[PDB]
Amino acid sequence: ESRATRHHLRGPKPHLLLGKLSEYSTPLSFQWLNFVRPRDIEWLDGHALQGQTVFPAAGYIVMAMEAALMIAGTHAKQVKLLEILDMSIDKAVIFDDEDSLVELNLTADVSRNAGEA
Amino acid sequence: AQSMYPNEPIVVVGSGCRFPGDANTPSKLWELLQHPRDVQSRIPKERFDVDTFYHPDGKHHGRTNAPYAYVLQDDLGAFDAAFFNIQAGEAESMDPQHRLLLETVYEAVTNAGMRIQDLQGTSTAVYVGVMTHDYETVSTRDLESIPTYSATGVAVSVASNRISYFFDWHGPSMTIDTACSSSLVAVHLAVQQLRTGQSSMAIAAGANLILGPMTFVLESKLSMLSPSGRSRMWDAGADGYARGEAVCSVVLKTLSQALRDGDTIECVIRETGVNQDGRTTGITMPNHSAQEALIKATYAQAGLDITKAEDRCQFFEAHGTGTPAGDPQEAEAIATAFFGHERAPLFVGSAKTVVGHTEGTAGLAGLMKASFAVRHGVIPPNLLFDKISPRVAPFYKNLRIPTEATQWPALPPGQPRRASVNSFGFGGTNAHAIIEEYMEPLSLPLVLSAKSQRSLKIMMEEMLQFLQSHPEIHLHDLTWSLLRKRSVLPFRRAIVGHSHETIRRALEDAIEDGIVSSDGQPSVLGIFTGQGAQWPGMLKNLIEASPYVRNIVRELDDSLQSLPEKYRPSWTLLDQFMLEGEASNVQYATFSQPLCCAVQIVLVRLLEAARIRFTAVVGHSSGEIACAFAAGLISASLAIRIAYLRGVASNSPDSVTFSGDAYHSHHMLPCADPYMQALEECGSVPWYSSVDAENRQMAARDVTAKYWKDNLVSPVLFSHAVQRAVVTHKALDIGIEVGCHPALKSPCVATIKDVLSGVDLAYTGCLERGKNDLDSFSRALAYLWERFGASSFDADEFMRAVAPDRPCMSVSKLLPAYPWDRSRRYWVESRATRHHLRGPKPHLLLGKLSEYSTPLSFQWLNFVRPRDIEWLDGHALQGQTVFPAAGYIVMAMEAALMIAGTHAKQVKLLEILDMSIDKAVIFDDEDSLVELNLTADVSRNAGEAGSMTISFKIDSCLSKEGNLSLSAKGQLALTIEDVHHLPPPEEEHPHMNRVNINAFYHELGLMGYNYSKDFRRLHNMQRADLRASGTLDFIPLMDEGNGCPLLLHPASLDVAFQTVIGAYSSPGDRRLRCLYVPTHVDRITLVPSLCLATAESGCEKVAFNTINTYD
Amino acid sequence: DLQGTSTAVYVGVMTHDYETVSTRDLESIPTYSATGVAVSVASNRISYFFDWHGPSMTIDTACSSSLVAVHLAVQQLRTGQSSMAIAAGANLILGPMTFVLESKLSMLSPSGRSRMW
């Protein structure tokens, strides 16, 4: 069992909006891998732009906040507050059809872990 | 005889091959084998970039030392899913092994001369040997993106089952896996399945494909593969086996079963034994004794004495994988089986030298080499054999590896050429097969069919090219093979032509037109043409081109001479008017009536020779007389005789053609009286009269002379007879205007449609107006075939009647293979999987970039062990080998380089800010793997501002038992461009006691810094005033897998760090009372251009200054 | 007694989670992974340990594999070439590969039990 393989067979639940944490993740660096298709996310059909189903920017924000929750849990921390700073939505995810799979990889790297602070 | 062997000799009747070197058919495979070429090539990036996995050391973690393989030159994703009734999603889900197995099995069935309909629903068995199922890993490495039909598409078993699923076979469908022997083992099982009699036919198939690095890495871990990339059988260069992509299918039958079915034979598998290696010196190690016992037992089962040369095999397709440990065992086994029990040698040659070691199908591959050879009497050579291996030399006394296409050794008369095939799978499952040569003790329409009209057009093009290439091939045999020995498919076309030129031009016309027909119906209605429709020179070509028609004409002449002397003979039109070149007009009753009668008699006899089941409706005048014969109650002789004697109508509800000032009128009424008076002394099929409206549609009432008189006297209700025939037999399928088309076409078809409301039953003419007789009849048969497949008529019986001499041969072997659509590439690749198979080189110190990386986020994954990094052994702390902090820094800088390259940026400057080494990577042993994952995320990409900020983290995991931890972290600030940057060094600090480098490193080791080799590269140093300077070797480091230098050899940077300690401590002072390791670097800053320039300059020795700022 | 005899082996294996779990991460793959996880070896190794020389097929006909092996073994026993024949079968749950693949076709029972008929 490569420790990546162990983290693959084992590991956290496939968190919604995030999928499974990458096998090569760390307490300091994480990469949740998912393949979102609208039919697998019942509510995602509601966000349509120009007819096409588009992953909401609020979706990216919720993904980031859930990643923050999972990171804090990894450090056994409870987040009293959760800011998202200088966030930018570069490319809207357009879903061709409700069964189309769009890969979302949320890579979150704790540049500062100052739980002492 | 060859069928008298103890166990019934199975027979290879056909084969389908997808072998490397463009060998997409057995003929091409044989040409390659007897004329080998350097087929092997670098693993195409279309399959997987092996350079992303290549490493000279085979045992290197996650690498393969064999970057070559005998790969197929075809797009394996290009598959005719529509042909096999497989949907796009399922076809993509399918293993390319399964798809190519389907294609090759269909090719083998075609070559054997079998229609899929004939085998459809039979008890045919399938035994597929597959070992290297890269699919079910490539398509499933990322569980996400796995298609719905992945389970069955990639399941190893389905490889066989799906075949039988498509062909509607009910025999056993094993998918065997005995490693390299798998396919051959399958043959054995197939052979057994054929010797039980439960399966009249058995596909023995094999499939090995190169779709992922899994197999390469696994085999190279054991050094099984050949780093040179070629399976040098029994050669001194033996260093493993080169993987090869091959999909083979072989149709096997019992010799008696094949002969009774009239299938052309490729070879005779006399016996196929399977044995296993005992507890050899290792699971992978083959056993010479086991293989010798296998050969001896197989020959004994075949009834062959191994000691006798007559019972011996002159050729031996050896396993011949090029393994230094396995090849000697095989040579010893061969020598001790065929010799060592006491003068041409016993030729030994492995196909894997030419097409590579194709693992699962390897056995079958060898079988093919043994098959074609034994069939062609040529011992194919071995491409890679330059010097006999010293280990194989002792057993090479009685053996000779052919380096040239050698003619078969002389044999005793009556003894078939005999070859042997050996395939040993790692684990030791050895399969041995004994093969032999089979001792072998007017034309039909050229029919083509495909599952798509595009495929049918490509078939027409390929057949035209084949005819141009092979004008020598008999047209009769070609058409008979295309009809009886080739599968019928939804989209159909038929080509009409008497000779090669005619058929080629008709094929050209069909190709230009593009008109084809789409989608047990031999029911035809015989509509018989009458006087007034006869064309000049009818049957002239048929009579002068078909001896069967000539014999029929002789019978007609005999009937003519049987007339009463008053009317004996009505001058023979068969030899006066049915003449080529003359084409004299025939309107005279004395000739026109018997001429049409003979035309229709000959045509109906030909149709019955094709076993066409008839319903009969009479026409007028001759159309009646001939129809009387078609009823199965009146002899043809009587019909033609009555027509000659007579020599001397309501066609449809909308058509009436009563004629006068002539027949059906008083003009011929008087002559009918004496004629009938002569007919009184002169003479099974549903048959309906029309001359007599209703009463004489019965068997017994149609023989009266008054009916033959009414033939010309009474009015003809042809429409009523057609109505009766088509309403009493609503199941009727087609109608044929026997004789002079198109006289009765329009009214007859209109009557059929009217009686059967809206039922536009097919209509066909067989002798057109002024057209070639052979072409006319062949076009009639072509229409019949295009309408009702092979069930329309039987070509075998037709050629049994027509041209009994030279029975048609199943030339399906030489016919072009089916032109698989290949338009759409059905493949599965998660973009992570694509980045895995593909992607950048495995950068040293970094490994492979993570599959889920981005231009903005990257994660290089590696498993560093000191022996795989030769220099890494030099950095030892407290004896343990420890990954240098300089190692982490160089990893970060190389990651910065790769990131800049990803953005097409050249780094003018590369700072590392606030770097921290959190956990030193301790290597327990030089072979211990420590996982290093460098995750670098460009928090700022301001190439517009010329900057790039990248937070980087080298996470480390010492052992797979533990979790992934942080080894180092920091930031990278890259000053970049779309393609003196640092302060000049201080003034070479003036006075510095010359630090004895040997003493310096001795003290460092005393304090736990056991630096060695590359990390003792500090050429000279001198320290004073809390400072040090000197010169350290800027030793270059380059990635052999990439062929380019790195920014820094971590040894040089670690020596630079040691300079800080030197400034802090002199040799022999012991100011370094504890082992300090770099924990937090405030700012490194490297000029990559200058570092690379120094590395490539060759000086590799650079000066340095250093301040021990805090001490 | 069986050591060195012509005993055959016919193993039915369909669900080789190993060769995927142990090879999902090509790094950390052990040296003997090739033969250790190769489907064929499943049979061969048996005969290798017991020093058997009979056929050592590793069959895969999906759920029928092992029974098919029996048939082959039966045939191998009716030829007289093997005084004995192991008919074996092996299905193990070591990775999610098989579960995900089968559930993609809904082959598996969500209730978790094969409710026959």
Residue numbers in the entry:
A (entry chain A): 939 to 1055
B (entry chain B): 2 to 343, 353 to 451, 471 to 548, 555 to 683, 723 to 735, 761 to 782, 794 to 1089, 1100 to 1231
C (entry chain A): 119 to 235
Sentences from the paper on this structure:
In LovB, the β-ketoacyl synthase (KS), malonyl-acetyl transferase (MAT), dehydratase (DH), methyltransferase (CMeT), acyl carrier protein (ACP), and ketoreductase (KR) domains are active, except for the enoyl reductase (ER) domain. LovB terminates with a condensation (CON) domain commonly found in nonribosomal peptide synthetases.
In this work, we determine the structures of LovB at 2.91 Å and the LovBC complex at 3.60 Å resolution using cryo-electron microscopy. The resolution of the maps enabled us to reliably assign the individual domains, dissect their linker junctions and finally build the atomic models of LovB. The α, β-hydrolase core domain and ferredoxin-like subdomain contained MAT domain have conserved S656, R681, and H763 active site residues, compared with DEBS and mFAS (r.m.s deviation of 1.89 Å and 1.67 Å, respectively). The KS domain adopts an αβαβα structure and contains the conserved C181, H320, and H367 active site residues with r.m.s deviation of 1.57 Å and 1.81 Å, respectively, to DEBS and mFAS. Despite the common fold shared by the KS domains, the substrate tunnels in the KS domains of LovB show differences from those of mFAS and DEBS, highlighted by the disconnection of the PPant pocket from the acyl pocket, possibly due to the hydrophobic interaction of the residue F436 with M132. The NADPH-dependent KR domain adopts the typical Rossmann fold, which belongs to the SDRs (short-chain dehydrogenases/reductases) family. The NADPH binding pocket with bound NADP+ nicotinamide ring can be clearly identified. Each DH monomer of LovB adopts a pseudodimeric hot-dog fold and harbors the conserved active site residues H985, D1174, and Q1178, which are contributed by both hot-dog folds. The S-adenosyl-methionine (SAM)-dependent CMeT domain comprises two subdomains and resembles the homologous modPKS CurJ (r.m.s deviation of 2.39 Å). It lacks the active site residues, and the substrate tunnel is disrupted, leaving no space for substrate and NADP+ cofactor binding.
